[model samples]
Target: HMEQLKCCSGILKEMFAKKHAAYAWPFYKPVDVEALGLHDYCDIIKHPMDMSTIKSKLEAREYRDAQEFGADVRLMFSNCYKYNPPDHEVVAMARKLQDVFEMRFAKM
Candidate 1:
């Protein structure tokens, strides 16, 4: 029981260091499911991603931005891919959005 708990905690710690999205890990598999027991028809939410898909159309889009716009824009696209962002923008419309949202907000 504790082992299964440790498994996920360890994954969280490793993901923190490695910059992996938690949903990208295959957490609740049969071999490692030593938890008290599965819940009634509990869904396996975190299916492991195929590494090959990383080379798909998304890569083509990043390359297009990099080739046409250069490295800073390329880096922005990479950052967009690195961690999922909310719906993105067209370059022309972004200035309108720039006024609409601030990345930093004060809690107070």
Candidate 2:
């Protein structure tokens, strides 16, 4: 389990750092399933990636850049969580990523 966590973290860090700060603490926290009171029912959880924040960072650039970046991040993380299952943390992370993607789509 520890090894798997390390692998997933490494993948995320590498992938996210390519476009944004890898250790950008507050900007990219995992979704809090327990806080949302859905820990018992949901298999995955994720943080809502604010499109406004992404837009702010992409100032003067087209929306496609932001959308592509978000989509890439989602794809990478989804792959990371897809292989490992039954683990609450991974599931929560996957769910949070999905939420972020959904929010991105809403903007379009």
Candidate 3:
């Protein structure tokens, strides 16, 4: 159990550190639907998520396993994909981030 716990923690720590250096880490915090002028964001994104929220959940030990944490990470990307158009810059970034996430996620 603790091994899986460490695995989850390790993935987040590594991914977040990478995000700090990369330009595609816009979802690092909660989206300000109001300030960003996303009128339909709340309507479209039923399960809003962000990296900070994931880290918070990790600190609280809310995930049952590594897959659960992975799922949440995917959900964050899914939300972005749903809200943005296929050609949107954020969608490209989301795709890039997901690729990095899966690459590291497979190591654990």
Residue by residue across 1-108, what tens digits does model 1's lDDT show? 334333333322443333433332321122233445433212542322222232232334432421222233233333334333356332323323222212211110
How does model 1 score by TM-score?
A: 0.20
Query: What does the lDDT come to for candidate 2?
Result: 0.44
lDDT of 2 by residue, 21-54 (tens): 4223323543444665545423543334432344
Candidates sorted by lDDT, best first:
3, 2, 1
- Write one digit per residue (lDDT tens) for candidate 3, span 4-108: 878777777766785443744687899899865698889988999998999999889898888888899999999988888899888988887788778878977
| C-alpha root-mean-square deviation, each candidate | 17.6, 14.8, 1.6
> Candidate 3, clashing residue pairs?
none
Each candidate structure's count of clashing pairs: 0, 5, 0
Question: Which residue ranges in model 3 land beyond 4 Å of their true spot?
Answer: 18-20
Single out the weakest 10-residue window by summed lDDT for candidate 3.
15-24
Tell me model 3's lDDT, rounded to 2 decimals: 0.83
Ten-residue segment with the worst summed lDDT in candidate 1?
A: 99-108
lDDT for each candidate structure: 0.30, 0.44, 0.83
Candidate number of the best lDDT: 3
Give the TM-score ranking, best first. 3, 2, 1
- Which residue pairs show backbone clashes in model 1? none
Alpha-carbon error at 20 in model 2, in Å? 17
